[PDB]
């Protein structure tokens, strides 16, 4: 059974690609419209367009499941409304065989989604966020929102802005004595990562003298810095959990585990980014169930409308079970399993009802 | 007259169902955003109930016109698919007469939306803001661990604490300082002191009387030869509630009677915006009638998504014009009325398409 | 009166579907319009009805050019219509399915409307279902109610569309009786149908439109014996 | 072979739409299924083919109980089906429509598939049009390609559904010729149709059902004289 497989696969693949293109275009348009409100001074229209375009792979990865659902609905509806699936079924081709034929060109889509969301999405998202932060500002010691604070037994660290290419903008160092005696008001602009030390740049330090001498400014060009911070550690904290690579999410979850702080949002992000193929499979199984049942001979518009409505109902529930799993106390795995599980159960029920 | 009642009762029910579905979807969409802030611990998750009950009148002001649009589309598409209107136009019924029939159920929606937008939404928004300001600021101050200290966004309240406490007694000690010197170019910009005090003396909604008997000021501008170090008492830390200012504004709660006479451009743009949804209803009703003509192959569920897109674009244009007009950029004589004129023109060119083609056919 | 279509023409995406077809229906006649499925039979029928705008030619009813008039303008001019699919007012009683049209008449006052409703309800023998809703009516009575409703507008011509399609052989007698009654009332009738046996049985003059042209015309005997219609439409073994 | 259906029964809205109807089609004869529109003719046909599950029934193909098998399960034992509407694979050539179904069969190798495809293409006189897309075929050749595709799966009974619906009187001769061709091979057809005049001609045994009960059966000359059918379905003046 080769020609039927290729026919159904090509149909559903093209339909899914078209739906994904339309959805991505709409999402980018809405995001640009929202971003227009913050155009002031340095944040020109060109920078906003660059940021919107660079955040395209993340949106495509996010909208892949809904696109797959709607595309499968449309592609199978084209065949069903022309009374061709009935011919296939009457020729001896089973129903599970048709489901397998539809899902054969869809493992490719799931694999592409995983690959583009673990290798391509984090890079572009990081570049776009850093560029937007730079365009908006961050000149002063505490100007940009993309800041962080780190402390040791006495060392105080504040970073005004972090760069994707292992660079910090606005390095600030302080030293307080055992009796809370101030000892340093260091300032820096850039830093380069070599070995484990941190090659600071534009070191405008200001060290306080205890007894009577007022501090002095030493404009040393560069100085190795003894900090346990790693560029991956400072990059991971800045980015939102829903925009991190799977390996990075796993490593950060474990690191948070070591220090004793509970991890409940990174776990949810990890489960969401890992169980995406299963959610896609459940959604498209339910779509196939829909085609063989209620939406058999209805028009294309009704299928599109039903797909969009159910996609809204599903995405709203998925995004509503997230914060609820953190306000309350139940494993985040439920927040990812429950909606896809009930979608698959309903699809199987309707398919068995034929 | 029988046809009039039939059409009105066929349109109103569909409008009601579509409006209910849209209201449920919008309420869920707002809940998924308030629950995130609840998960951060900023707001009590027991008051989300009221906030919805106080904000729903503000949703049944942009939902009802869209409900009417979709209801007219669906109802007249259903009547068109079953040849129910072919035999109505084959016994004599102008499309102008159909518009006249449809304009009566639109009048009820216009009256309801005018009431909700001029006398109910402001009261509800005012009550919601009042009750969010009153007792929901108790969670303004939240402490996680001694490792995560306090760094207020004001740029002047940064300090250190040891192990926190539920009774707020073990988190003493203060290293407060404005600390906006960068390269230490100023002296008055730091209020550094050494303290083991800072008892949580909460009297108002977070306001603290944290006077410290332990403190040594280090005013002396670092990097220079001027050493100026004296005793420092404390820096008062009163905690206000900025949640309300982040989400809503004062304009949306002003009673209509306070906007009839005013010179503030914002207080007049608000009045021009409030009187825009009653005209929204009529404009979308005019747009809906020519669109609803469908073929059996198209079905009634085809132009629903473009209709939603068009309505959202209309609302976005209204809001953008209002926001660029209350700044004084656009003189308050054109107002938002040119948006309504544009959409009325694009509806009129659609209601007069077939007659125009027939006339051009000579 | 006289409904005339002269030199009708149309063209869909390049190809010319119809060209120079001339038909004429007098008041009281029963004229049938038949032809091969792919030809311009349905295009000509819908061009006379008003759902398709003619590229050329005129359609006039007794010196009244109604070519460039909408469907409602034609209906006020005198031309009726009755679609093939079920087109009864579902959530409306039978007595209201007719009154909803009788209320638009200008020459009828309050008492005249009731009198005409009673006349139409008694003429077609639907007095017993005067209260039943339109959606609960059977197949046989739905057509009677639709015909009475279309007659409530006092049309001068009725253009039936596939009356016999999907109809049992026992229910074509009722449809033929209704059509004969309508002819007796003086209303000219135009019929287009796929079934060419009952249509030729009932119609008095028939037109064949093949390849977009009027290949033959005349009564049943002269149309069943023509060679062109017997070698492009009917086949050499038709009766 | 014999496709005997015994004691069929069904109910949709708690009401016995079809009750106690039994039909039997030998392999090598053409059997018609007729009746009024509201009766249980379409329901019985769909229960026989398999699209509608039967609450009771002993549907068996020569001592092979297949009442519980799905549509594909029934078709594997060999039961054809041909939808009334167009069911051609749109974006596939004629030579691909047959080959796609041929590849389903498990008793053919590559050379066997090729030989069978050429045999089917030459048998139905569609060798010239072996590259046109299925969506670009006229109604005359679309039906031939559909029947060739249906025969490619090698069934034992073909259940046609409304073959003579919406066709010209010159296009029923081709369908009758194809049905005679199928009958010659050995397949047993089960034509069901709204039109009666030639359905009772091509077929040689009819099972007329009314009110969901078998009321009569037998040859055309032996059913046209039956009083019950002439009272309920055929009327008192048919033929
Ligand atoms: C919100 C949208 C919910 C899905 C709507 C799908 C379309 C339903 C059409 C119903 C048509 C119908 O009822 O008539 C067909 C048949 C009776 O004849 O009725 C039937 O026997 C079939 C009825 C099928 C109804 C299927 C509903 C499935 C809903 C699955 C959940 C979708 C929403 C939730 C998504 C996940 C949320 C966590
Ligand atoms: C301010 C801007 C906001 C923008 C938001 C965008 C949202 C997009 C979605 C719009 C929602 C519209 C919902 C209205 C659908 C009404 C459907 C209807 O009346 O059709 C009934 C239909 C039966 O159709 P049939 O008889 O086959 O002809 O059967 C159906 O299709 C039944 C469908 C039932 C839907 C139930 C959904 C429930 C959702 C949670 C509550
Ligand atoms: C088949 C379906 C058909 C559907 C059709 C839908 C039609 C919808 C029609 C309406 C669409 C409206 C879209 C735009 C509305 C929002 C505009 C906006 O936000 O721009 C205002 C923005 C604010 O600037 P601000 O900071 O106030 O500067 C004040 C100057 N002292 O001011 C700016 O700085 C604006 C800069 C340029 C704006 C360009 C907008 C481009 C939009 C492209 C859409 C495609």
Domains in chain D: ranges and CATH: 1-80+158-163+188-239 (3.40.50.300), 84-154 (no CATH)
User: What are the phi and psi torsion angles at D7 (to 5°)?
Assistant: 55, 45
Query: Which chain D residues have a beta carbon less than 8 Å from that of A1?
Result: 103-104
User: Crossing angle, helix A95-115 and helix A56-81, to 10 degrees?
Assistant: 170
Residue C131 tokens read as 């209260």
User: Which of B241, B176, B234, B177 lies closest to B206 in space, CA to CA?
Assistant: B241
Distance from the Cα of C103 to chain B's closest Cα (Å) equals 7
Distances (CA, A) of A341 to A277, A280, B76, C46: 13, 11, 38, 53
Query: Which chain B residues have a beta carbon less than 8 Å from that of C72?
Result: 89-90, 92-95
Among the candidates A209, A227, A245, a domain finishes at: A227
Residue B167 tokens read as 């009774």
Q: Is B293 helix (H, G, I), strand (E, B) or coil?
A: coil
Residues 6+ positions from D114 with CB-CB distance below 8 Å: none
Q: Is position A315 within any domain?
A: yes
The ligand minimizing its distance to the Cα of A315 is 1
Residue C28 tokens read as 């009281």
Question: Smallest Cβ distance to A180: which of B149, B194, B221?
Answer: B194
Environment class of B177 (CB within 10 Å of its CB; exposed 0-12, middle 13-18, buried 19+): buried
Task: Determine which of C46, C65, C71 to mutate to test the interface with B (most B C-beta atoms within 10 Å).
Answer: C71
Compute the Cα dihedral for A80, A84, A88, A91 and give only its sign: positive
Residue A73 Cα to ligand 1 midpoint, Å, equals 14
Q: Do residues D175 and D189 touch, judged by C-beta distance below 8 A?
A: no
Residue B275 DSSP label: T
Rounded Cα distance between C166 and D36, Å, is 10
* Number of CB atoms found within 10 A of residue A247's CB: 11
Distance from the Cα of A208 to chain B's closest Cα (Å) equals 7
- CA-nearest residue, atom 8 of ligand 3: B313
Residue A209 DSSP label: P
Asked whether residue A206 falls in the same domain as residue A108, the answer is no
Q: Is position A289 within any domain?
A: yes
Whose tokens are 């073909």? That residue is D158
Distance from the Cα of A1 to chain B's closest Cα (Å) equals 33
Rounded Cα distance between B263 and B245, Å, is 23
Note whether B155 contacts A305, CB cutoff 8 Å: no
Whose tokens are 């309050």? That residue is C110
Rounded Cα distance between B80 and D81, Å, is 34
Asked whether residue A123 falls in the same domain as residue A222, the answer is no
Q: Is B306 helix (H, G, I), strand (E, B) or coil?
A: helix
Q: Is the CB of A313 within 6 Å of ligand 1? A: yes
Q: Do residues B44 and B138 touch, judged by C-beta distance below 8 A?
A: yes
Residue C161, strand partner residues: C192
β-pairing, C15-26 vs C2-12, is antiparallel
Rounded Cα distance between A258 and A173, Å, is 26
How would you write chain C as a 3-class SS string?
Answer: CEEEEEEEEEEECCEEEEEEEEEEEECCCEEEEECCCCCCHHHHHHHHHCCCCCCEEEEEECCCECCCCCHHHHHHHCECCECCCCCCCCCCEHHHHHHHHHCCCCCCCHHHHHHHHHHHHHHCCCHHHCCCEHHHCCHHHHHHHHHHHHHCCCCCEEEEECCCCCCCCCCHHHHHHHHHHHHHCCCEEEEECCCHHHHHHHCCEEEEEECCEEEEEECHHHHHCCHHHHHHCCCCCCC
Q: Do residues D7 and D18 touch, judged by C-beta distance below 8 A?
A: no
Distances (CA, A) of D78 to B141, B153, D2, D105: 76, 78, 11, 12
Rounded Cα distance between D127 and D129, Å, is 6
Q: Would you report the helix, strand and coil content of chain B in percent, each value rounded to 5? A: 55, 5, 45
Residue C232 tokens read as 């492009």
Atom of ligand 1 nearest to the CA of A343: 36
Question: Smallest Cβ distance to B38: which of A208, A319, A327?
Answer: A327
Asked whether residue A188 falls in the same domain as residue A107, the answer is no
Asked whether residue A219 falls in the same domain as residue A300, the answer is no
User: Crossing angle, helix A56-81 and helix A300-327, to 10 degrees?
Assistant: 140
Number of H helices, E strands in chain B: 12, 2
User: Which of C67, C54, C137 lies closest to C95 in space, CA to CA?
Assistant: C137
Residue B329 tokens read as 């950029």
Query: Which chain D residues have a beta carbon less than 8 Å from that of A83?
Result: 83, 85-87
User: What are the phi and psi torsion angles at D207 (to 5°)?
Assistant: -125, 90
Residues 6+ positions from C172 with CB-CB distance below 8 Å: C164, C198, D235
User: Which of C46, C139, C146 lies closest to C94 in space, CA to CA?
Assistant: C146
Compute the Cα dihedral for C158, C159, C165, C166 and give only its sign: negative
Q: Where are the domains of chain B?
A: 2-138+245-360, 141-240
Note whether D170 contacts C194, CB cutoff 8 Å: no
Q: Do residues B109 and B102 touch, judged by C-beta distance below 8 A?
A: no
Question: Smallest Cβ distance to C170: which of D168, D195, D235?
Answer: D235
* Cα A272 versus chain centre, distance: 10
Asked whether residue A131 falls in the same domain as residue A279, the answer is yes
User: Which of B111, B135, B130, B127 lies closest to B55 in space, CA to CA?
Assistant: B127
Rounded Cα distance between B306 and B293, Å, is 15
Residues 6+ positions from B127 with CB-CB distance below 8 Å: B54
* Number of CB atoms found within 10 A of residue A254's CB: 11
Query: Which chain D residues have a beta carbon less than 8 Å from that of C196?
Result: 169
Residue C79 tokens read as 């031309």
Distances (CA, A) of D129 to D67, D85, D101: 39, 21, 18
Residue A31 Cα to ligand 3 midpoint, Å, equals 12
β-pairing, A167-176 vs A182-187, is antiparallel
- Exposure string of D69-88, with b = 16+ CB inside 10 Å and e = fewer, is bebbebbbbbbbbbeeebbb
Asked whether residue A35 falls in the same domain as residue A122, the answer is yes
Atom of ligand 2 nearest to the CA of B311: 2
- Exposure string of B203-233, with b = 16+ CB inside 10 Å and e = fewer, is eebbebebebebbbbbbbbbbbeebeeeebe
Query: Which chain A residues have a beta carbon less than 8 Å from that of B194?
Result: 179-181
Asked whether residue A161 falls in the same domain as residue A286, the answer is no
Residue D17 tokens read as 């739409």
The ligand minimizing its distance to the Cα of B65 is 2
As a whole number of Å, the end-to-end CA separation of chain C is 35
Tally of domains in chain A: 2
Q: Is B220 helix (H, G, I), strand (E, B) or coil?
A: coil
Rounded Cα distance between B140 and C74, Å, is 73
Note whether D170 contacts C197, CB cutoff 8 Å: no
User: Which of B222, B227, B188 lies closest to A204 in space, CA to CA?
Assistant: B222
Residues 6+ positions from D151 with CB-CB distance below 8 Å: D80, D120, D158, D182, D187
Rounded Cα distance between B80 and B66, Å, is 21
Atom of ligand 3 nearest to the CA of B314: 10
Environment class of A187 (CB within 10 Å of its CB; exposed 0-12, middle 13-18, buried 19+): buried
Distance from the Cα of C202 to chain B's closest Cα (Å) equals 24
Asked whether residue A167 falls in the same domain as residue A217, the answer is yes
Q: Is the CB of B13 within 6 Å of ligand 2? A: no
In the structure, do chain D and chain C come into contact, i.e. share 3 or more CB pairs under 8 Å? Answer: yes
Asked whether residue A131 falls in the same domain as residue A267, the answer is yes
Query: Which chain D residues have a beta carbon less than 8 Å from that of C37?
Result: 139, 166-168
Residue D170 tokens read as 């010159």
User: Which of D44, D52, D53, D50 lies closest to D24 in space, CA to CA?
Assistant: D44
Question: Apex CA D220: angle with CA D214 and CA D223, to 5°?
Answer: 45
Tell me the Ramachandran region of residue B337: left when phi exceeds 0, alpha when psi lies from -120 to 50, beta otherwise: alpha
- Exposure string of D116-127, with b = 16+ CB inside 10 Å and e = fewer, is bbeebbeebebe
- CA-nearest residue, atom 8 of ligand 2: A309
Asked whether residue A18 falls in the same domain as residue A125, the answer is yes
Note whether B358 contacts C70, CB cutoff 8 Å: yes
Q: Is A11 helix (H, G, I), strand (E, B) or coil?
A: helix
What dihedral angle (degrees, nearest 10) is formed by the CA atoms of B69, B70, B76, B81? 150
β-pairing, C213-218 vs A155-163, is unpaired
Distances (CA, A) of B82 to A73, B79, B300, C86, C89: 26, 6, 11, 7, 9
Rounded Cα distance between C36 and A103, Å, is 45
**Structural gaps in chain C: residues followed by a C–N separation over 2.5 Å:** none
Rounded Cα distance between B119 and B264, Å, is 21
Q: Is D207 helix (H, G, I), strand (E, B) or coil?
A: strand
- CA-nearest residue, atom 8 of ligand 1: A294
Can you give the resolution of this entry in Å? 3.3
Neighbour subunits, D (≥3 Cβ pairs < 8 A):
A, C
Rounded Cα distance between D239 and D233, Å, is 13
Note whether A151 contacts B149, CB cutoff 8 Å: yes
User: What are the phi and psi torsion angles at B361 (to 5°)?
Assistant: -75, 0
Note whether D100 contacts A7, CB cutoff 8 Å: yes
Residue A273 tokens read as 């980014």
Among B269, B314, B324, B344, name the best residue to mutate to test ligand 3's pocket (greatest count of ligand atoms within 8 A of Cβ).
Answer: B324
Contact status of A17 with chain B (Cβ, < 8 Å) = no
Among the candidates A183, A206, A227, a domain finishes at: A227
DSSP string, A109-132: HHHHHHHIIIIIHHHHHHHHHHHH
Rounded Cα distance between A92 and D155, Å, is 10
Rounded Cα distance between D188 and D206, Å, is 13
Whose tokens are 């002191």? That residue is B193
Residue A282 Cα to ligand 2 midpoint, Å, equals 22
User: Which of A148, A168, A164 lies closest to A156 in space, CA to CA?
Assistant: A148
* Number of CB atoms found within 10 A of residue D64's CB: 11
Q: Do residues A234 and A148 touch, judged by C-beta distance below 8 A?
A: yes
Residue C12 tokens read as 């869909």
Q: Do residues A54 and A124 touch, judged by C-beta distance below 8 A?
A: yes
* Number of CB atoms found within 10 A of residue A50's CB: 16
Q: Do residues D76 and D226 touch, judged by C-beta distance below 8 A?
A: no
Q: Is the CB of A316 within 6 Å of ligand 2? A: no
User: What are the phi and psi torsion angles at C7 (to 5°)?
Assistant: 55, 40
Structural domain boundaries, residue A18: 3-136+260-353
E-state strands within chain B: 216-217, 230-231
Q: Is position A204 within any domain?
A: yes
Residue C163 tokens read as 């009356």
Residue B57 Cα to ligand 2 midpoint, Å, equals 22
Residue A33 Cα to ligand 3 midpoint, Å, equals 6
* Furthest-apart CA atoms within chain C: distance in Å: 59
* Number of CB atoms found within 10 A of residue A348's CB: 14
Rounded Cα distance between B236 and B258, Å, is 38
Asked whether residue A21 falls in the same domain as residue A116, the answer is yes
User: What are the phi and psi torsion angles at D31 (to 5°)?
Assistant: -120, 130
Q: Do residues D31 and D190 touch, judged by C-beta distance below 8 A?
A: yes
The alpha carbons of chain C give a radius of gyration, in whole angstroms, of 18
């Amino acid at each position: 059974m080769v020609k039927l497989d290729r026919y159904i696969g090509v149909t559903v693949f093209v339909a899914i690609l078209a739906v994904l293109g339309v959805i991505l275009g709409l999402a980018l348009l809405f995001a640009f419209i929202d971003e227009l409100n913050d155009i002031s001074a340095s944040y020109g229209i060109g920078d906003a367009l660059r940021f919107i375009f660079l955040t395209a792979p993340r949106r495509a990865y996010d909208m892949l499941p809904m696109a797959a659902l709607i595309g499968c609905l449309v592609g199978l509806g084209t065949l069903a409304s022309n009374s061709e699936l009935t011919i296939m079924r009457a020729a001896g081709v089973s129903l599970s065989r048709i489901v397998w034929a539809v899902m054969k060109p869809m493992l490719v889509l799931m694999l592409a989604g995983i690959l583009v969301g673990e290798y391509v999405a984090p890079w572009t998202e990081n570049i776009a966020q850093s560029g937007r932060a730079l365009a908006q500002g961050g000149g002063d010691s505490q100007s940009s929102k993309r800041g962080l604070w780190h402390r040791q037994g006495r060392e105080y660290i504040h970073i005004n802005a972090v760069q994707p290419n292992g660079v910090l903008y606005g390095v600030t160092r302080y030293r307080f004595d055992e009796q809370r005696g101030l000892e340093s008001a260091s300032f820096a602009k850039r830093a380069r990562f070599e070995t484990d030390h941190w090659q600071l740049e534009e070191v405008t330090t200001t060290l306080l003298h205890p007894r009577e001498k007022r501090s002095e400014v030493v404009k040393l060009p560069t100085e190795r810095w003894d900090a346990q911070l790693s560029p991956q550690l400072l990059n991971t904290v800045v980015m939102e959990p829903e925009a991190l690579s799977i390996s990075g999410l796993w490593q950060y979850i474990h690191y948070l585990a070591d220090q004793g702080l509970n991890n409940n949002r990174y776990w949810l992000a990890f489960w969401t980014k890992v169980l995406q193929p299963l959610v896609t499979a459940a959604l498209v199984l339910m779509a196939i169930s829909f085609i063989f049942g209620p939406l058999r001979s209805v028009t294309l518009g009704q299928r599109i409308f039903t797909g969009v409505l159910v996609g809204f109902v599903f995405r709203i529930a998925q995004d509503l079970l997230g914060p609820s799993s953190l306000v309350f106390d139940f494993p985040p795995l439920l927040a990812v399993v429950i909606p896809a599980s009930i979608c698959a159960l309903a699809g199987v029920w309707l398919l068995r009802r034929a | 007259m029988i046809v009039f009642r039939y059409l009105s009762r066929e349109v109103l029910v569909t409008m009601s169902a579509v409006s209910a579905v849209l209201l449920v979807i919008i309420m869920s969409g707002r809940f998924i955003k308030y629950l995130a802030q609840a998960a951060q611990g900023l707001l009590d998750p027991g008051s989300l109930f009221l906030i919805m009950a106080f904000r729903i009148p503000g949703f049944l002001q942009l939902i009802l016109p869209l409900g009417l649009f979709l209801g007219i589309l669906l109802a007249y598409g259903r009547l068109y698919l079953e040849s129910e209107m072919t035999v109505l136009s084959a016994t004599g019924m102008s499309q102008k007469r159909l518009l006249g029939y449809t304009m009566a159920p639109a009048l009820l929606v216009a009256i309801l939306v005018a009431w909700l937008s001029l006398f109910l939404a402001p009261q509800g928004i005012n009550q919601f803001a009042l009750l969010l300001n009153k007792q929901d600021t108790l969670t303004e101050f939240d402490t996680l661990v001694p490792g995560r200290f306090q760094a207020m966004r004001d740029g002047t309240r940064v300090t250190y604490t040891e192990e926190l406490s539920k009774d707020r007694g073990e988190l003493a000690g203060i290293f407060i300082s404005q600390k906006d010197l960068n390269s230490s170019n100023q002296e008055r910009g730091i209020s550094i002191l050494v303290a083991e005090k800072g008892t949580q003396n909460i009297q108002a909604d977070g306001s603290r009387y944290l006077i410290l008997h332990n403190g040594y000021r280090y005013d002396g501008n670092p990097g220079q030869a001027n050493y100026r170090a004296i005793q420092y008492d404390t820096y008062g830390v009163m905690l206000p509630k900025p949640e309300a200012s982040s989400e809503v504004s004062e304009r949306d709660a002003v009673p209509t009677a306070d906007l009839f006479g005013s010179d503030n451009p914002r207080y007049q743009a608000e009045l021009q915006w409030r009187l825009s949804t009653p005209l929204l209803v009529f404009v979308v009703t005019l747009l809906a009638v020519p669109l609803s003509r469908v073929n059996p192959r198209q079905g009634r569920f085809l132009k629903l998504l473009p209709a939603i897109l068009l309505y959202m674009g209309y609302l976005a244009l209204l809001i953008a014009v209002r926001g660029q007009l209350d700044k004084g950029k656009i003189p308050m004589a054109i107002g938002l009325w040119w948006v309504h004129g544009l959409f009325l023109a694009i509806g009129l060119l659609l209601f007069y398409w077939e007659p125009l083609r027939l006339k051009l056919a000579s | 009166a006289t409904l005339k279509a002269q030199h009708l023409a149309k063209s869909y995406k390049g190809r010319q579907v119809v060209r120079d077809v001339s038909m004429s229906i007098d008041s009281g006649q029963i004229v049938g319009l038949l032809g091969p499925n792919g030809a311009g039979k349905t295009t000509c029928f819908y061009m006379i009805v008003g759902l398709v705008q003619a590229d050329q030619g005129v359609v006039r009813i007794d010196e009244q050019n109604v070519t460039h008039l909408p469907m409602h303008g034609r209906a006020r001019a005198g031309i009726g219509y009755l679609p093939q699919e079920a087109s009864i007012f579902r959530k409306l009683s039978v007595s209201d399915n007719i009154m909803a049209i009788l209320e638009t008449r200008s020459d009828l006052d309050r008492n005249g409307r009731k009198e005409a409703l009673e006349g139409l309800l008694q003429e077609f023998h639907i007095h017993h279902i005067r209260d039943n809703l339109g959606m609960s009516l059977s197949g046989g009575e739905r057509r009677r109610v639709e015909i009475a409703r279309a007659l409530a507008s006092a049309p001068k011509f009725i253009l039936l569309d596939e009356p016999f399609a999907g109809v049992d052989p026992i229910s074509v007698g009722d449809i033929k009786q209704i059509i004969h009654h309508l002819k007796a009332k003086g209303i000219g009738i135009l019929i287009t149908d796929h079934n060419v046996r009952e249509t030729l049985d009932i119609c008095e003059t028939a037109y064949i439109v093949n390849d977009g042209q009027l290949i033959a015309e005349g009564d049943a005997e002269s149309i069943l014996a023509n060679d062109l219609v017997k070698e492009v439409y009917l086949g050499h073994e038709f009766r």
